[PDB]
């Protein structure tokens, strides 16, 4: 019937026919297979690390050349098989399609559309790991974001090329908070990536539920690696991203990525190393994380045209490879004593501490400010965002400074009382939800309290939340110009008139 012709087609394909060959091995003897670690012999000197496609496809990449002595491995089920079996050798490690085609495409970590997608949108083949762009091949892109918290931008805006650590909290949302991130990103519909290992199928599933819930869901793609993803593979995904990530960065497009559970790659290298019976760094994993995250951590390349060959080389493409890096920092207690957290911590172009306290006592946004420190900062905050962004650490001081007064029971002063009015009341101002988008036309919303009398205006948290939302009404009433505003995104007092009279509408908006 329908696909019968395909057989002919297959016959057409199989028309390529066949021959026997390689009269002399061309093969080894996999001397003693132990759990996919094969003492192995035959066909010895070669490309080190060659993935050697063994029975099944299994391409065993073993870079361990003892003089004369072989042993080898590849991710997979070695339990039933026996030792000595002649080494079936693919020449090396491989490359999965290299292209920008994927968009939001879905797959196994191999790119195997474990979605059942079957989908391959990428060109050709992409080997995994790569270095960063050179001077002015990477050059700072300041491209900002307000990520779903107004404070998201407000604390530290940024641009392409950047990697900032954010410490994270177990079972706090700091995966679900970490989830809560993508709001503006799916909204961004811009080039990004993300990676996960050892993954949980439920979290996978419901996650996907959010993915559709996320408007975009295609704005970026991720391959998937589950609880069986090899400690190898665990180490692999970070290598993997660059593969076609070029087809943005090399495309001169912003490449951007996200890696998480990097510990999985580490102790991956541990049960590797102890499995290697090889003395590793502490925690049974080798200290390569320096190099492993030297090679690994290098890549981030802000848009710069000494990527003059990026993409077309350069058919210009003489152009600005942008690669923005997305870190994931979390630990039980968030322990920096990890040599990983130590050196790794050093490499961070930003370091954000997340406080379990806020969302702990429940304040939806939980994070630890100023314990959160990122180097990129509100440089990317545009002229108004640049303008209005100042007072933060102030109440971080002031409010907390106001806090100090309690230390002596009944110590306060009306001035300090104003430092809990701004400090504590203006403290009452800020919030970000369990799921928070951020408008950045909300940038104005911010600049109000000082700019508007919103410092005083609707000072009641009842009226702050309430009456402020009623100012969101006043937008419903009057939000004509915000077109020209989010359009603008910059400090102009001409607006600021509309900021005062805005505050009048806020009287109208209560």
């Amino acid at each position: 019937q329908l696909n019968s012709t395909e057989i002919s087609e297959l016959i057409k394909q199989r028309i390529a026919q066949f021959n026997v060959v390689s009269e002399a091995h061309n093969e080894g003897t996999i001397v003693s297979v132990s759990d996919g670690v094969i003492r192995i012999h035959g066909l010895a000197d070669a490309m080190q690390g060659e993935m050697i496609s063994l029975p099944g496809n299994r391409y065993a990449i073993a870079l361990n050349l003892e003089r004369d002595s072989v042993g080898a491995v590849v991710m997979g089920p070695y339990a039933d098989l026996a030792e000595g079996m002649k080494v079936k050798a693919t020449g090396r490690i491989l490359e999965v399609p290299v292209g920008r085609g994927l968009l939001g495409r879905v797959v196994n970590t191999l790119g195997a559309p474990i979605d059942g997608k079957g989908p391959l949108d990428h060109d050709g083949f992409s080997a995994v790991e790569a270095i960063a762009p050179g001077v002015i091949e990477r050059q700072s892109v300041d491209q900002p974001v307000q990520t779903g918290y107004k404070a998201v931008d407000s604390m530290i805006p940024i641009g392409r090329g950047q990697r900032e650590l954010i410490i994270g909290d177990r079972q706090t949302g700091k995966t679900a908070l970490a989830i809560d991130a993508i709001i503006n990103q799916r909204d961004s519909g811009i080039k990004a990536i993300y990676v996960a290992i050892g993954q949980k199928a439920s979290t996978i599933s419901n996650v996907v539920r959010k993915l559709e819930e996320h408007g975009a869901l295609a704005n970026t793609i991720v391959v998937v690696a589950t609880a069986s993803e090899s400690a190898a593979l665990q180490y692999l995904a970070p290598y993997a991203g660059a593969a076609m990530g070029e087809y943005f960065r090399d495309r001169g497009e912003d490449a951007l990525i996200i890696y998480d559970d990097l510990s999985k790659q580490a102790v991956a290298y541990r049960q590797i190393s102890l499995l290697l019976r090889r003395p590793p760094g502490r925690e049974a994993f080798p200290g390569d994380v320096f190099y492993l995250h030297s090679r690994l951590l290098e890549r981030a390349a802000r848009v710069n045209a000494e990527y003059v060959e990026a993409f077309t080389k350069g058919e210009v493409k003489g152009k600005t490879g942008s690669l923005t890096a997305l870190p994931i920092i979390e630990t039980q207690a968030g322990d920096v004593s990890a040599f990983v957290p130590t050196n790794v911590i050093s490499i961070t172009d930003g370091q954000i501490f997340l406080e379990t306290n806020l969302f702990n006592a429940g304040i939806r946004p939980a994070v630890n400010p100023g314990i959160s420190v990122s180097r990129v900062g509100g440089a990317a905050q545009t002229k108004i965002m640049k303008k209005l962004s100042g007072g933060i650490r102030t109440a971080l001081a002031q409010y907390r400074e106001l806090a100090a007064f309690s230390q002596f029971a009944s110590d306060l002063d009306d001035a300090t009382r104003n430092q809990l009015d701004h400090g504590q009341k203006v403290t009452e101002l800020l919030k970000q939800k369990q799921y928070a988008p951020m408008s950045v036309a909300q940038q104005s919303l911010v600049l109000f309290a000082a700019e508007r009398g919103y410092l005083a205006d609707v000072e009641l948290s009842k009226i702050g939340s309430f009456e402020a939302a009623l100012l969101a009404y006043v937008d419903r009433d009057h939000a004509p110009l915000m077109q020209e505003i989010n359009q603008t995104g910059g400090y102009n007092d001409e607006i600021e008139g509309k900021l005062k009279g805005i505050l009048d509408s806020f009287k109208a908006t209560q």
Partner: protein
């Protein structure tokens, strides 16, 4: 190159790692340092023998990576490590971390294939002596004394005009000082390094120092390499008598660098696995840098903060590698003065009381009294209405306005940057003009008159301008 004519060696026995499990021409072993230059696939391979171990089987290592080759091999033995074209010709011309023509061919002037191994002198050789130093920075070389041919711990945060003042160092170490002014760095931001080429045009004086850079992704040996060849360079400058003074980037890169080093050894390393002898490498280090006989072997001492370590066996060593203590004031940058940094915590060690004796024990030590004077005059007298404070405390606030304004002074940097000319300053006009004036003399000298104005003829003759 040396020999390594003959391809030497033999196989790489167990192919693991840049250090050699390798068959050399088994009888063949060089000095462990003495290099072995193979072909690395396409590339010519090289390893200075990491180990000296027989059978041509010894660790021999490199900053690169080995995957893909056969355990079989042969590796030519570069009879010399360390010998690489070196001398003062490099100045301004871009050396790779290899010294390679880093730029479009940066062509740091090819010079003696010159052993990196240049090191400590005899007791007398580089100065059995003491050699003091100042370039006459407007408010600063006056502020602190210094010892020539050396390095001093630099603590300060931001907004240094370190590139500006470097232009003042161009205007000094190149200009107001002759002695060959060289510098080098490693581990930067790519186009921001290129932006230090932009700055290299800002000073434009980049010609004094070859451009040689690390770009921290450089492997640990790569990261840690360049120095001793740097001594094949001061093997020009100081050795060239045009006193080697070279600016020194990165300790954390170096501290942690030696950490990654002794780690890679797997050896009982220093504590917390650091380089055990990294400090002894500091003995070799200051052992290199001396106001010399040859020419003062001098270095700008500023540290990639080894995490700005607490008690910092680095700062422990960098203390006593600081002849002068250092601080930079965002507050004087908040004062924004042409003196924009922290004089607090910045002075030479022995300057005031002795060693200038009164010269600084009066002008500078008494000047430090004045630091108490606007310290509690500005500070204490600021606490409440200073009406209580004798106008001396308000002439310690004219030490602030008036005198501290005089501190604000044009800069040979600011010449080389904003045009604000600045100078090699004369602390006489401080020790007198600013000491007497700032203290009792012409206290009517306006802040502004003094502000952004050089020595007491610029501040006080700007008080003729008032």
């Amino acid at each position: 190159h040396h020999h390594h004519h003959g391809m030497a060696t033999g196989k790489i026995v167990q192919v693991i790692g840049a250090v050699v499990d390798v068959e050399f021409p088994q009888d063949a072993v060089p000095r462990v340092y003495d290099a072995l230059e193979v072909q690395n696939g396409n590339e010519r391979l090289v390893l200075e023998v990491q180990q000296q171990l027989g059978g041509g089987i010894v660790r021999t290592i490199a900053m690169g990576s080995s995957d893909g080759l056969r355990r079989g091999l042969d590796v030519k033995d570069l009879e010399h490590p360390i010998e690489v074209p070196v001398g003062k010709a490099t100045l301004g011309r871009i050396m790779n971390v290899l010294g390679e023509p880093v730029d479009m061919k940066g062509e740091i002037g090819e010079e003696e294939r010159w052993a990196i191994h240049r090191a400590a002198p005899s007791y007398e050789e580089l100065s059995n002596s003491q050699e003091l130093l100042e370039t006459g920075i407007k408010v600063i070389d006056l502020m602190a004394p210094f010892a020539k041919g050396g390095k001093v711990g630099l603590f300060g945060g931001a907004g240094v005009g370190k590139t500006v003042n470097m232009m003042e160092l161009i205007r000094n170490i190149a200009i107001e000082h002759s002695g060959y002014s060289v510098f080098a760095g490693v581990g930067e931001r790519t186009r921001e390094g290129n932006d230090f080429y932009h700055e290299m045009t800002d000073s434009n004086v980049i010609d004094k120092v070859s451009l040689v850079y690390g770009q921290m992704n450089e492997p640990p040996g790569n990261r840690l390499r360049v120095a001793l060849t740097g001594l094949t360079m001061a093997e020009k400058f100081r050795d060239e008598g045009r006193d080697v003074l070279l600016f020194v980037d990165n300790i954390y890169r170096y501290t942690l660098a030696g950490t990654e080093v002794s780690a890679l050894l797997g050896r009982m390393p220093s504590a917390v696995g650091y380089q055990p002898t990294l400090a002894e490498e500091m003995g070799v280090l200051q052992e290199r840098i001396t106001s010399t006989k040859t020419g003062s072997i001098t270095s700008v001492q500023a540290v990639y903060v080894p995490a700005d370590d607490l008690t910092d066996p680095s700062p422990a060593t960098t203390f006593a590698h600081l002849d002068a203590t250092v601080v930079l004031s965002r507050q004087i940058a908040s004062l924004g003065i042409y003196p924009a940094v922290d004089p607090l915590d910045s002075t030479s060690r022995q300057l005031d009381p002795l060693v200038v004796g009164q010269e600084h024990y009066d002008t500078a030590r008494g000047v430090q009294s004045i630091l108490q004077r606007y310290q509690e005059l500005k500070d204490i007298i600021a606490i409440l209405g200073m009406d209580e404070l004798s106008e001396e405390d308000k002439l310690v606030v004219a030490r602030a306005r008036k005198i501290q304004r005089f501190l604000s002074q044009p800069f040979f940097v600011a010449e080389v940057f904003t045009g604000s000319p600045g100078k090699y300053v004369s602390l006489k006009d401080t020790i007198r003009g600013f000491k007497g004036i700032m203290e009792g003399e012409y206290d009517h000298l306006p802040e502004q008159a003094f502000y952004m104005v050089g020595s007491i003829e610029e501040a006080v003759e700007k008080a003729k301008k008032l």
